[PDB]
Amino acid sequence: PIQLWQFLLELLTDKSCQSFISWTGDGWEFKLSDPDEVARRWGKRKNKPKMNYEKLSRGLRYYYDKNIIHKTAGKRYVYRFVCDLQSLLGYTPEELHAMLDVKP
Amino acid sequence: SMVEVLADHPGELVRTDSPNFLCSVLPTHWRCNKTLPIAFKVVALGDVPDGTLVTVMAGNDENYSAELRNATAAMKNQVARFNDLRFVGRSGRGKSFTLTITVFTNPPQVATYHRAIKITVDGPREPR
DNA sequence: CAGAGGATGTGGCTTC
DNA sequence: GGAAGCCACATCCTCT
């Protein structure tokens, strides 16, 4: 059993995926630069060949209430974890950025 | 009066613990936050002037006071037609909510519909 | 198009 | 073990 936000967190902590999903450099804010690739990989991980960005984002919208992820208004494909990731990862955003050579 | 009204529009009305009011039959088990198949209505046998407000509360041993939606209606020609009433709160495994209907006359009146409806996250569902 | 949210239907899991 | 609950989407869809 894997959840959308956990999956996005995996992609965001693997430097190989930085071409399609990456942190913005601002806190826990991230961007799906290539929404289709994330969707495809999300579809593959759940075994849902038809998965696309329109349905993956519906998944993200349900998180608005659960205070897990919020949208960054005005910036296409940009969201931000609002839960306590530091607590869960044991790293501040600045430390995690550095481990991944995140370019703001 | 009550006998004629129940026969007026047969099968769809049920008795409250109050002799001056009757209400729509509710499904035995329904999905929380889902629209009811039949619009819930409260009928007044005695005289209730139009405009009188009517509300419903739901609750039982697990949930003293359940979250509802559109739980307020206005009497018109002795009928309070709730526009899309909904049950958001859950009533607990194997349990049903008890409805308390309050008709805002002066003085207020209260009619009760015991063990009226079970509300769960899935609602009536096909066997797996 | 992107994005908010409502309405429904499913598979995975946990509780009795 | 199974029925009945809870969850997290997957799918569509209306609207801004």
Side-chain angles (χ1 to χ4, degrees), chain B:
Chain B
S1 178
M2 183 124 80
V3 169
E4 308 157 1
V5 173
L6 283 141
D8 161 24
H9 276 174
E12 23 149 352
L13 297 184
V14 72
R15 263 179 234 175
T16 69
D17 67 356
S18 171
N20 312 307
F21 303 88
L22 292 168
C23 69
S24 313
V25 185
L26 284 170
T28 278
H29 178 195
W30 207 241
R31 181 175 183 166
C32 78
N33 219 306
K34 186 188 182 59
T35 287
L36 298 174
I38 291 80
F40 188 74
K41 312 171 201 287
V42 167
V43 188
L45 303 182
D47 186 24
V48 175
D50 293 5
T52 299
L53 300 180
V54 179
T55 72
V56 33
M57 302 190 311
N60 67 23
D61 297 337
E62 318 279 328
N63 197 158
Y64 294 357
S65 183
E67 198 188 327
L68 308 183
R69 276 177 57 201
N70 308 311
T72 298
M75 203 64 104
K76 174 129 191 183
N77 291 175
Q78 323 307 114
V79 182
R81 208 253 185 196
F82 282 82
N83 180 51
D84 195 19
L85 164 68
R86 302 200 192 181
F87 300 80
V88 173
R90 268 76 77 181
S91 65
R93 185 180 194 124
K95 295 192 164 191
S96 289
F97 279 144
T98 288
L99 300 197
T100 297
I101 308 172
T102 308
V103 175
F104 290 83
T105 44
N106 215 330
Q109 285 174 283
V110 174
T112 302
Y113 181 2
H114 296 274
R115 297 182 297 291
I117 184 171
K118 179 174 70 176
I119 295 293
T120 70
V121 174
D122 287 353
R125 187 170 170 186
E126 315 62 77
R128 306 292 276 282

